[PDB]
């Protein structure tokens, strides 16, 4: 699959069976999704985002399926306006920026 | 060429021949660089950063040269901690996210 960049590259991932609309974002290092109640195995973490640091549950080994590629990968959970899939997941997905 | 995303995708662009390092950010709509002095034909904009607005100057038709591909594009300058090339320049360069 190939995302034209003429529109925002949003897509539906299935995080552990649950569907979320996420932005494929090569300028972000890690991911962070709002909405899914995800698990019981989380370290606390923090992330900035517009303003400053807010509180996130960071999960390891989560199952993400995107465009029929299922993958296990870390992800974080908290309040964002945008659900971001950063480079941590883009690389597990096998994605690349092309010429 | 295709770029994997193991590292931050940072490249030397040339803006009117002047080299700056920029982050290829598919997560960004627009583009903004600091430290470039592009002139007086611009319109004032204000763009929201994490923790507040910054005031910017928007220039049209600027010659960008990235990876041997020369295009013209709109570009803002302002005090940004990172020089981002958002989608408005990624599309002009013919760049795509691939899976």
């Amino acid at each position: 699959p190939q995302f034209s960049l003429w529109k925002r590259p949003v897509v539906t991932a299935y995080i552990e069976g649950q569907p979320v609309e996420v932005l494929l974002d090569t300028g972000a290092d890690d991911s962070i999704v709002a909405g899914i109640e995800l698990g019981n195995n989380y370290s606390p973490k923090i992330v900035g985002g517009i303003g400053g640091f807010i509180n996130t549950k960071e999960y390891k080994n989560v199952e993400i399926e995107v465009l029929n590629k299922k993958v296990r990968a870390t992800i974080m959970t908290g309040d964002t306006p945008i659900n971001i899939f950063g480079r941590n997941i883009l690389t597990a997905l096998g994605m690349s920026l092309n010429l």
Side-chain angles (χ1 to χ4, degrees), chain A residues 4 6 9 12 14 25 31 41 58 70 73 81 87 92 98:
Chain A
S4 69
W6 294 96
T12 14
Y14 290 88
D25 190 339
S31 318
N41 313 55
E58 192 206 46
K70 159 248 145 64
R87 292 181 305 104
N98 269 258

CSV table of all heavy atoms in Angstrom, one decimal, chain A residues 4 6 9 12 14 25 31 41 58 70 73 81 87 92 98:
chain,number,residue,atom,x,y,z
A,4,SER,N,-0.4,8.4,-0.3
A,4,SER,CA,-0.2,9.8,-0.9
A,4,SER,C,-0.2,10.7,0.3
A,4,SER,O,-0.9,10.5,1.3
A,4,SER,CB,-1.4,10.2,-1.8
A,4,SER,OG,-2.6,10.4,-1.1
A,6,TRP,N,-0.9,13.8,-0.1
A,6,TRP,CA,-1.7,15.0,-0.5
A,6,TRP,C,-2.9,15.1,0.5
A,6,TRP,O,-3.4,16.2,0.7
A,6,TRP,CB,-2.3,14.7,-1.8
A,6,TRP,CG,-1.3,14.7,-2.9
A,6,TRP,CD1,-0.7,13.6,-3.5
A,6,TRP,CD2,-0.8,15.8,-3.6
A,6,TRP,NE1,0.2,14.0,-4.5
A,6,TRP,CE2,0.2,15.4,-4.6
A,6,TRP,CE3,-1.0,17.2,-3.6
A,6,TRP,CZ2,0.9,16.2,-5.5
A,6,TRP,CZ3,-0.3,18.0,-4.4
A,6,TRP,CH2,0.6,17.5,-5.4
A,9,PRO,N,-2.1,11.2,6.2
A,9,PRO,CA,-2.1,9.7,6.1
A,9,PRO,C,-2.7,9.1,7.4
A,9,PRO,O,-2.0,8.6,8.2
A,9,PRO,CB,-0.6,9.4,5.9
A,9,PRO,CG,0.1,10.5,6.5
A,9,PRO,CD,-0.7,11.8,6.4
A,12,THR,N,-6.9,3.0,9.8
A,12,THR,CA,-7.5,2.3,10.9
A,12,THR,C,-6.5,1.2,11.3
A,12,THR,O,-6.2,0.4,10.5
A,12,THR,CB,-8.8,1.6,10.6
A,12,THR,OG1,-9.0,1.6,9.2
A,12,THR,CG2,-10.0,2.4,11.2
A,14,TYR,N,-6.0,-1.9,14.2
A,14,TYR,CA,-6.7,-2.6,15.2
A,14,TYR,C,-5.8,-2.9,16.4
A,14,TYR,O,-4.9,-3.8,16.3
A,14,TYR,CB,-7.2,-3.9,14.5
A,14,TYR,CG,-8.3,-3.7,13.5
A,14,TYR,CD1,-8.0,-3.4,12.2
A,14,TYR,CD2,-9.6,-3.6,13.9
A,14,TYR,CE1,-8.9,-3.1,11.3
A,14,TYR,CE2,-10.6,-3.2,13.0
A,14,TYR,CZ,-10.3,-3.0,11.7
A,14,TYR,OH,-11.3,-2.6,10.8
A,25,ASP,N,3.1,8.9,11.2
A,25,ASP,CA,3.7,10.2,11.5
A,25,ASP,C,5.2,9.9,11.7
A,25,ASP,O,5.7,9.7,12.8
A,25,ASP,CB,3.1,10.7,12.8
A,25,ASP,CG,3.6,12.1,13.1
A,25,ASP,OD1,4.6,12.6,12.6
A,25,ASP,OD2,2.9,12.8,13.9
A,31,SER,N,4.6,6.0,19.6
A,31,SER,CA,3.2,6.1,19.3
A,31,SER,C,2.4,6.5,20.6
A,31,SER,O,2.9,6.5,21.7
A,31,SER,CB,2.6,4.8,18.8
A,31,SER,OG,3.5,4.2,17.8
A,41,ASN,N,-1.1,-4.4,32.3
A,41,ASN,CA,0.4,-4.4,32.4
A,41,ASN,C,1.0,-3.1,31.8
A,41,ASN,O,1.4,-3.1,30.6
A,41,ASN,CB,0.9,-5.6,31.6
A,41,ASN,CG,0.1,-6.9,32.0
A,41,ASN,OD1,-1.1,-7.0,31.9
A,41,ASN,ND2,0.8,-7.9,32.6
A,58,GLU,N,2.1,3.0,29.4
A,58,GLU,CA,2.9,2.5,28.3
A,58,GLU,C,2.9,1.0,28.3
A,58,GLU,O,3.2,0.4,29.3
A,58,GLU,CB,4.3,3.0,28.4
A,58,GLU,CG,5.2,2.8,27.1
A,58,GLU,CD,6.7,2.7,27.4
A,58,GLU,OE1,7.0,2.1,28.4
A,58,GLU,OE2,7.4,3.3,26.7
A,70,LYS,N,-0.2,-7.7,10.9
A,70,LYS,CA,-0.3,-7.8,12.4
A,70,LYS,C,1.1,-7.8,12.9
A,70,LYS,O,2.0,-8.4,12.3
A,70,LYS,CB,-1.1,-9.0,12.8
A,70,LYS,CG,-0.9,-9.5,14.2
A,70,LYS,CD,-0.2,-10.8,14.3
A,70,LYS,CE,0.8,-10.9,15.5
A,70,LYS,NZ,0.0,-10.8,16.8
A,73,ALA,N,4.3,-4.7,19.3
A,73,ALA,CA,5.1,-3.5,19.4
A,73,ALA,C,4.7,-2.7,20.6
A,73,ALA,O,3.5,-2.8,21.0
A,73,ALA,CB,4.8,-2.7,18.1
A,81,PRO,N,-5.3,14.6,21.2
A,81,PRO,CA,-6.2,14.9,20.1
A,81,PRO,C,-6.0,14.0,18.9
A,81,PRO,O,-7.0,13.5,18.3
A,81,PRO,CB,-6.0,16.4,19.8
A,81,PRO,CG,-5.3,16.9,21.0
A,81,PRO,CD,-4.5,15.8,21.5
A,87,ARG,N,7.6,6.4,14.8
A,87,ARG,CA,8.6,5.6,14.0
A,87,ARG,C,8.8,4.2,14.7
A,87,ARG,O,9.2,3.3,14.1
A,87,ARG,CB,10.0,6.2,13.9
A,87,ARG,CG,10.0,7.5,13.1
A,87,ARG,CD,11.4,8.1,13.0
A,87,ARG,NE,11.9,8.4,14.3
A,87,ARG,CZ,12.9,7.6,14.9
A,87,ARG,NH1,13.3,6.6,14.3
A,87,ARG,NH2,13.3,8.0,16.1
A,92,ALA,N,8.3,-1.4,12.8
A,92,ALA,CA,7.7,-2.7,13.0
A,92,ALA,C,6.8,-3.1,11.9
A,92,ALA,O,6.8,-4.3,11.4
A,92,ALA,CB,7.0,-2.8,14.3
A,98,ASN,N,9.5,7.2,0.6
A,98,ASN,CA,10.0,6.9,-0.7
A,98,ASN,C,10.2,8.1,-1.6
A,98,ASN,O,9.4,9.0,-1.7
A,98,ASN,CB,9.0,5.9,-1.4
A,98,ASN,CG,9.4,4.4,-1.1
A,98,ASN,OD1,10.0,3.8,-2.0
A,98,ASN,ND2,9.2,3.9,0.1
